[PDB]
Design a protein around this ligand. Structure first.
Ligand SMILES: [Zn+2]
Ligand SMILES: [Zn+2]
Ligand SMILES: [Zn+2]
Ligand SMILES: [Zn+2]
Ligand SMILES: [Zn+2]
Ligand SMILES: [Zn+2]
Ligand SMILES: [Zn+2]
Ligand SMILES: [Zn+2]
Lengths: 201, 201, 201, 201, 201, 201, 201, 201
């Protein structure tokens, strides 16, 4: 009875965290890609309830990412951000020119497409802006996921809507090993080639 | 050895799906909220590699959602979309006016904040637009997650960038029971109030 | 040989609990419905030997419930009562008028039916009493299982045959979610609508 | 999607068996005692959702038992009844005289106690009726649980509110062995005494 | 290495117990029947290596039992004996007369059968001794397994080859409950009859 | 109803196998040693109710073994016998001279000890017979458990009280490996010496 | 009985495979490095009894490798060879000059060290031969494990002691991924750079 | 995040143990046979990353074994060696004469076969040397795996390329029991003979 009450209150508190001002278990927000192969929680070593996980095409900083990140940090008590791009990302496999050309071929008029139906204030007035909107790596002048992870970290770090006390870190998810690496730590070459090793003490 | 070869071809395929033209394992894109309590794959009954999962604050249709959905459907071969909002969502616990007022208090100037750093073409020129940008349920005139799931489905259905042959369906994730429901199909009211039954035959 | 002896005594104790003045393991009696979907022990978090479980149509306080409750508390040492009604209960799906009219249709004469064969002193002398005997929610002016759990608790609390030092509590078993809730503390509405929350401190 | 719908409908049906006129999985109603030691489903070899389980002090046919049995058989489609009394039942350890005398000692006035608060039509007008109301084995002239199981079966069989096509069977739950026996099948004497055996063919 | 020394010394002691003078884990010897239904270890609550288990037709004290018991107690360090007869024992289902008559019918000549081929000194010179040799309960004037368990205990207690410091105890295995009892301490009669219980403190 | 009925008989039959002339499930009788390390049923691959298991000091054919074997085969329908001696058996670690000398040292007078109290007809009238009665391997001129298994098989095979249609087999239980072997079929002698191998084809 | 005979056929065959001319389960021989990180069976997808696994410093073809390979193929019926070198192998981390210099520093005289004590015919008569004996990648003019896998395959393919009908294949074990790759097919470059992909058909 | 950086730094260390000069986890090198039945790590009670495992035909000390042992001990920090031969080893099933005669039959010219293609300095100049090269037990005058384990230990112990502070131990893997034993410490012969046993205390 006392047990049931105790456990019911626990449920009430879980069901209404966002009413009560209860944060996620680890005060963590993650930006990553929507890709199926990015099994994000296992790679971070976290449990289902530990983090808020934002996912878009590319794990790239968009207005929506910044929107979501500003809310979680300022209102839902998140004190840590982790940006995780990944290998073989689709955003590194195509160009916005290709995509735009693909759409005009069907009959789409870039200038007069409602990009955010729920926010008509968002408009572009240029086909070059339409191309940049898709945020493909090449169009953004980004050569690797490593560079993109660093790019996103710097953006979020410098953005006014995100508190300065929030810790922000970037990684790259390797789909070929279901696991992270530090951006630009690439030991794949180093292991298949001579390097003078040291005698064990 | 022969089985080792074709296994390596298979890992090669998995590693390079997005290069090679392989979709996710059933051709599925999911829009849902970033919330920690939304354990999305278990509720859909899917495996890690089965779907592209888009997640933002509220599981609401933003430009980024439409961007991501347009790419998966037209280029990555997704033929099904599932929109899943959830109960006790933060977007249904606050107002954009409150959030805007919070930011001005710190010293932020809504008009001159770069909302999308990587896309400077996105501007608002109005504090009312800044409020609407956050996309809180109240400000969008949406009363329930049920209504928001239906709203998102309709938007995606009617959007030109999303092919007409794509199946789109909406659900609500109940955090208090880790289980989906159809919008407006709440069993919890009907079971706790007289309703006439039928005699068994 | 010693540990075998002791074990045989406690085997003997177990088989003769009701001679030796041994109570149930938690000194608990539960009133609930006979319904198949009410998996009562798992919902209370109790083990098979922990409680005396009374079950009738509706988990409603009848003379038999009070009989059984009086015996367990006064003679079998029960110090706690838990009343548990449930959702989609049959007693909330029909009316006694319907049931009575069903029986007369077959040829039953309400006035002349022996309701308690082993206790002929129980008679009604009125078709209105026959209707009330079935104890359907509607006929008793009870709108919900929540209200019926509270009702039963109050009855047992006020009844002279039940000691005043017995703890009595009420809950509702949700068949939809195989889980208990406190009467009138339904979370499902609250989570699905706007309610203002607090910022995380 | 069609999977989720299918499973939600399965849940809809479970949650509203009683609105939808759906029976228990096995069309079974069980009368048994409230005693903790009677682990009824295990002994019948049935699963949680298979039966409606009525439980009172003694597994004795009361008005409430007949009320509940009439409803399940006529309205909820139950086609089988099993009566199961048990060994070392409390109703076989005391007398109603003892119980009545116990209550007068505290200050209770049998004549003026509301036995069924929700049904004031139930009255006794005699201390002998009050004694018989408790339904102790000895006061009913019943010597064993075996006899009581048979007695209950006969009552239910002959009662007009219970359809004649319903199968009714009686057993005795042995708490010493957590298992059932046919009433009056006592092999315990037969196994510890000489008995001419037969050679195996 | 450390581990492998340990592993090897474990095997060596276990495999050479009777050379190295190592006792059974519980310094226990059990006399019981060969019957399949007597699951002796489970009923004593012992592990495979805990005891020396002697088993013959009936769990009766024979020369071989006394031989085996004398060896385990004096040489293998057994300090406890447990005699356990059982219910529905074959030795309580037939007579030696019947068995002897059965053998003569085939053509056996009792007087000239080698009863112990490895010990020719064992002879009988009487048909009445041949009958007694089979050791059926009836022919020994024993009415119950309870009585036989007590009988065997007394014999072993008073036998000179068995040290006086050895603890000897008797039980009866109930095949119909897979469960021991003290001899002549039955409850099954007591649990299906009225008996005044006592109110719980 | 039907299920519980057929189960109660399965149980009634189980409790009264020896009255009804139902045998053990394999129609098997096993002669083995009482030693703790001989985990007999696992080594034979049998279940608890499958066999009658006779156990004495050494798994040696004694009068009691023959008594028990004659009863199980002729009356309890056993059609197979398995003799299983074992390694490091105590009967192969001492001599009857040693044992006899140990007993006289305490004060025992071999000639006047009742070897079978329940069968006074069994007498020896010689200290050499007393030695032989213990049935140590050495005194019987048996060098190995292998030889003893074969010896027991031969005795039982040629004994008139045991039907000739009964199948009799011998094995040795290796305590060092919890596993059986056929007599004098030791794999360990062959795997550590040279043995002309055969080219694989 | 006839169960135990199959059990013993299995044991006898398993333990005398090399006598009886029974091959390994997969007719496979593997050459790989002794390195701890090379979890060879898992990477080949084979079971413990499937292959003969030769391991030395580097997974390099030595006389011993050829000795072992010639025996398994010609006599033990192996029909497939798999050579698997690995990344970060020690043989690609040092030079034989370094090693030789290390040994002379301690006081070793290369010319007069017994390199094969059991085969005195193996001698070198040159410090350059001593260096080459260690078989370091650099000294052999081999740049990668990929190249070494191919080299080993070619050697074994062209060697007269190895039958021509034996299938020989080479792979590289990636310690950093605990999985295999085909010589010179490294995808990790390709997954972190732009590469034009295909629209899912 | 800090946890994640810590785990990345381990993965880097693991991937480059040989460059960075980290040993195997128990500074262990094992010499054993390539035979499938020798499940070496389970028998040693070690984990995959715990040792460097050298395997050839027979677990015999060859030049390659010494090469590999010298490198692991002097450069990779191995401080313990374990030599483990095994039962039913192929090297104890054939003779080098047989093998040589087999090869000449096909048309091989022993004198002119490149035994180590990558080390031309290795030559034999004699058919007797060719026979000895195969290193069959019989040709080396070794009678058992026990003797061979001891032999290899002594060779490695006395070899100048192996440091004197390295611990070297020998065992024999019994394929018949998947278990290691010390050289010549065979319990099997000791458990089937008579052996003076000690009385227990
Ligand atoms: Zn991506
Ligand atoms: Zn949300
Ligand atoms: Zn109900
Ligand atoms: Zn009872
Ligand atoms: Zn018996
Ligand atoms: Zn023994
Ligand atoms: Zn290596
Ligand atoms: Zn071998």
């Amino acid at each position: 009875s006392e047990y049931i009450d105790s456990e019911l209150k626990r449920l009430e508190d879980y069901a209404l965290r966002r009413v009560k001002g209860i944060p996620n278990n680890r005060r963590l927000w993650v930006l990553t890609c929507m890709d199926e192969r990015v099994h994000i929680e296992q790679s971070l070593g976290i449990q289902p309830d530990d983090a808020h996980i934002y996912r878009n095409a590319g794990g790239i900083v968009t207005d929506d990412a910044i929107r979501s990140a500003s809310l979680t940090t300022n209102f839902f008590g998140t004190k840590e951000i982790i940006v995780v791009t990944h290998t073989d990302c689709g955003m590194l496999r195509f160009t916005g020119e290709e995509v735009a050309k693909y759409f005009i071929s069907k009959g789409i008029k870039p200038t007069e497409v409602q990009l955010d139906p729920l926010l008509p204030a968002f408009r572009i007035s240029s086909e070059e802006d339409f191309i940049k909107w898709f945020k493909f790596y090449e169009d953004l002048g980004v050569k690797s996921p490593d560079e993109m992870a660093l790019k996103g970290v710097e953006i979020l770090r410098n953005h006014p809507l995100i508190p300065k006390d929030v810790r922000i870190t970037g990684y790259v998810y390797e789909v070929e090993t279901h696991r992270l690496r530090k951006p630009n730590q690439i030991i794949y070459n180093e292991t298949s080639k001579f390097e003078h090793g040291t005698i064990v003490k």
